[PDB]
Write a protein that binds this DNA or RNA. Structure first.
Lengths: 56, 224, 132
RNA sequence: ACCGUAUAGUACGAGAGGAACUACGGUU
């Protein structure tokens, strides 16, 4: 909890920032920034993206 | 015994508190009159853990559990989780559960032996509940409502269910839960007995508005 | 009332048409006035999340239709401010019919509810599946 | 300028009901 990881790319999220998405079924996605969210909205999966930490 | 109190001017104690035989959870921002209701009769007996769940203070509806374990929503922050693990005894397991039917406290109704769950819950989740709470789980509906934890207050002594529950369901549920069950109301007419009061084997806390007859049924069925 | 604990910009005015979040039988509601808050913007009265509002039933079953009832705003398109600073916005605007006493039935909501609201109306909270 | 909490389910009251000084949080 003290450390935060982007539920998308996997990179660390600077504290005091980032956005949290509420699933509605109360699932939670913590996004480091808009670019990640944008990709997610795209319905791309982080593993597919080479730049993402998750992939690498 | 059985006492009355309020969180602010709310009688729905079950919404802001969670009581088991081995621990008590209360919302972080309560008043002395509210906290005392428990401190005064639990004393140094069992841990009284102040907390928030997913940042909210409606911890009674946001969690479910008994003496062996506590279930918390996924959105429970790591800080709240760490605080819980540290305050509650080691023998109790704290597990995050991912279910979106409703708040855990409305979907699950349990004592230390049996637990009723929302009838639409998935198998994987129903096994997790049984596992963590070390209890037998049954998908049920109380008088038609799927929010079992909201229409049923239960201890190992007895239980109270929706006032319209037929005698036939009461008899069947009694057998299923292994405790005497009686249809009744709390906080002056409310049929949401699950949210209106908290209770364990030795203490029952309900709202200031619970009538004399309603409190009589409570201390009688929960054997207080 | 009790502090909501978050900052809200009122999304709805009187006359706004909103979705009815429950299984009462009322599909859509019209906001007549904002009662449990007081008329905040007063010349055009405005209501937002957490407010209690008086409503009339525009669409729904005939029994429900044209009934004037109280309700609580569960969600709104316009953003809110959290203490942390994050803003949250919902897909649509919706409210749940509540009683004179202040109870829901409290079958379900369907969908998530704001923690702020649950705190103000515990009974409604007592029937929420999830609170964000 | 208002709401809320502590004060306090206290003083006052048969009961129903139900304040304040002060200290806080917030809204407009």
């Amino acid at each position: 909890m003290k450390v935060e990881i982007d539920s998308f790319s996997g990179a660390k999220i600077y504290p005091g920032r980032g956005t949290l998405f509420v699933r509605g079924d109360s699932k939670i996605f913590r996004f480091q920034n808009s670019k990640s969210a944008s990709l997610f909205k795209q319905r791309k999966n982080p593993r597919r993206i080479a730049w993402t930490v998750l992939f690498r | 015994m059985a006492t009355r109190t309020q969180f602010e001017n709310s009688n729905e104690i079950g919404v802001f508190s969670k009581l088991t035989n081995t621990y008590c959870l209360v919302a972080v921002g309560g008043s002395e009159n509210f906290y005392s209701a428990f401190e005064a009769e639990l004393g140094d007996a069992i841990p009284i853990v102040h907390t928030t769940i997913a940042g909210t203070r409606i911890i009674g509806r946001m969690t479910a559990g008994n003496r062996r374990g506590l279930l918390v929503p996924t959105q429970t922050t790591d800080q709240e989780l760490q605080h819980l693990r540290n305050s509650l005894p080691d023998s109790v397991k704290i597990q995050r559960v991912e279910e979106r039917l409703s708040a855990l406290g409305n979907v699950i109704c349990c004592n230390d032996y049996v637990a009723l769950v929302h009838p639409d819950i998935d198998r994987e989740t129903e096994e997790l509940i049984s596992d963590v709470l070390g209890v037998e789980v049954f998908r049920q509906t109380i008088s038609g409502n799927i929010l079992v934890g909201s229409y049923c207050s239960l201890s190992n002594q007895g239980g109270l269910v929706h006032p319209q529950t037929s005698v036939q369901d009461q008899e069947e549920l009694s057998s299923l839960l292994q405790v005497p069950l009686v249809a009744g109301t709390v906080n002056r007419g409310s049929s949401v007995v699950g949210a209106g009061m908290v209770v364990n084997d030795y203490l029952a806390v309900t709202g200031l508005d619970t009538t004399a007859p309603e409190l009589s049924v409570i201390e009688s069925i929960f054997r207080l | 009332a009790q502090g909501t604990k978050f900052r809200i910009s009122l999304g709805l005015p009187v006359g706004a048409i909103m979705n009815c979040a429950d299984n009462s039988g009322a599909r859509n509601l019209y906001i007549i006035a904002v009662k449990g808050s007081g008329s905040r913007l007063n010349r055009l009265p405005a209501a937002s999340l957490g407010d209690m509002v008086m409503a009339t039933v525009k669409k729904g079953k005939p029994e429900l239709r044209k009934k004037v009832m109280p309700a609580i705003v569960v969600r709104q398109a316009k953003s809110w401010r959290r203490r942390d600073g994050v803003f949250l916005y919902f897909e649509d605007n919706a409210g749940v019919i509540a009683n004179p006493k202040g109870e829901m039935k409290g079958s379900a909501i369907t969908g998530p509810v704001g923690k702020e609201c649950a705190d103000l109306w515990p009974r409604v909270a007592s029937n929420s599946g999830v609170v964000v």
